[PDB]
Symmetry: D3
Subunit: 147 residues, 6 copies
């Protein structure tokens, strides 16, 4: 008998990012919004940075400023709030020192300590209900070593 | 380095439905069927109804009667069994009183107590093996406040 | 109000495979690869074989030898390592005896004891970094009863 | 050359009615509630349960055996009251009724097993306008239920 | 002005063979089994395990040290027998053998660690045609294993 | 005809600072570390935590109250040292400082609650070139933290 399963993977051998539990991060995520609290439940996940060189510092920024755009109207865009490892993420690059990442402290050689990843969004005129419908965008992730 | 993640969300600010854990319900679900027990493992999930007005009663029905239709033969349809919060769901509307939902009892203002959601299906001539192959359909969800 | 959810399922009433928790196996899986350890985190999952006849032995092999093929270059293929229930899986068929599967030992009639399922992959010249980019393939699953 | 692993196996058997977890696991004997200095509140403990009965036609009455309190474990005069909740109805010494039909016995699983229902135990300071004194506390939630006839 | 949190750290170290959980966590010292009045049965406890050994070439013998029973904790005459299972083989006082090759040592993880195997502890009434008396019970599963030479 | 389920409710209340789990659950009083004969090492216990404070402008100092050890519970002379870690900084008797800004107080949740941080307790043999003697051990991790002014 035959059951079929697609296997895909995403290699990169200088530096990558996976969840603490070793599985790959997903390729997409659905955020929720609450009528009662008028806000969006965020998305938390734990990640360990892998690398071939732990000695390097690590700088972070979004390839471009993240938004959830109405899929039937471009003019409607509620901004996306990104946060990694206690630090807010934007175009304005943030630097992450190796010793501040706790490399020894975890894992087999190279792997870092778990860092929190949060993604969320808020209405631009926060507190006034957003317009109904579906929304979408891409949070893109830029991180290099050596500043 | 660049890793890409799609962010989508689904706003609605009068009333919505999310899982108890605050994440959004999925957009699709795979049910299983068992050869040995000749039945289908159901799908359970916990949800909290959000709203801008807790005072309203809540009526529920499927936009239309739910089925799993063979994807290579429309003539083959095993019916879909839906159940929310101890009450079976159909076209025949079911009413859910606010005080019976336990609003105060949970959460920040407005949010309700967790309610179970079950989806399943059975062979129409239950007990005689269904024909092999893939099947599909949409469970659509109708809930309004004020009867 | 209307929220939409797709329900799909995959019937087969002589023999099927589902996870121990009763949910269906996914249709696809993303493996991860680690820069630091230069390896791929595997994918473990627990399954119970269902059947209409527990008395039969069970033979296993992949419909064809499993690979992760660069999606922009066919010439790049890192091999896929498959393992089920303590036994490595390949084209070379492996036989699984019913009494060795522990049928009584579990579940309502017919269902077997949980068996581990591992999928992974390794560089073909293991220890030398693989080339970056995305990769893909299908692990296909062949299991019949009666050898 | 003797390698042995011991595991203690216990069970609270009741043949008429019992409240288990949604997953079929037994409820905890004990639960620990954290408290937040930042938000000045306790994090409620929540768990999905299902009544299992031998008579699914019967009503279900549930009540606490005594008003539950967090008690300073070095000073019995210090208390914060415990709040309990089940299937959306706040519990008390004053009983609450749950009709067999509002329990969802049809909609779920085997005979005599209910739909799932949220059990919540939290606590609070006496006047939210003030914080509790530091230290350890403890208390007992004593759940009491008859089905009827 | 002193805020301290204490955590007790324990460990059962065996250098030759030990059975851990699939996730690497240590097995429980204790397990609680719920019982269902509706279905008149106990919910088995199940957990994925992996033998870790220092010799993966050796056979693995496993057995209970004494036939396990649930015992009424107010009346020792009252018992329901405990059923134990591992890697699909029912356990007993009578040993069972598990060949190094049927354990899946190659297929998984580091040297000396097995594929995953289901450990099941449940129990039952003495004659399914009757229910147990209400009350609390308890018992001990005492797992015994040699590898060999 | 009396069916009652008792649940013990406890709580460690501190109004100035407390470390809870990321999910809001209270940390464990106790943790069990398995050890692997195959890999000759212990499986570290790991859990995501968040400081909750009443002053998110303050620094956070954290230290152990005494150097933690696994102690043979039949022979006090036998020890394996315990290693503790939090938010990527190895803990000790020698204090460690954590600036309010390196904690991620903005990036997460309600006022006064930090971003998540990994707490790790593991242990090791004294000279990795040798194994520990078999038996049970136990010890105490005693976490100590001031915020400051
Ligand atoms: Mg639960
Ligand atoms: Mg009360
Ligand atoms: Mg497990
Ligand atoms: Mg036995
Ligand atoms: Mg946690
Ligand atoms: Mg230390």
């Amino acid at each position: 008998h035959e059951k079929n399963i697609t296997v895909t993977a995403s290699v990169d051998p200088v530096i990558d990012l996976l969840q603490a539990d070793g599985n790959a991060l997903p390729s997409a995520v659905k955020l929720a919004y609450s009528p009662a609290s008028k806000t969006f439940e965020s998305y938390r996940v734990m990640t360990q940075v892998h690398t071939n060189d732990a000695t390097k510092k690590v700088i972070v920024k979004l390839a471009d400023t993240p938004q959830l755009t109405d899929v039937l109207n471009s003019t409607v865009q509620m901004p996306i709030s990104v946060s990694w490892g206690g630090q807010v993420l934007s175009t304005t690059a943030k630097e992450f020192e190796a010793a501040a990442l706790g490399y020894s402290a975890s894992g087999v050689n190279g792997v870092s300590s778990s860092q929190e990843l949060v993604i969320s969004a808020a209405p631009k005129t926060a507190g006034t209900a957003p317009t109904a419908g579906n929304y979408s965008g891409v949070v893109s992730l830029v991180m290099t070593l050596g500043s």
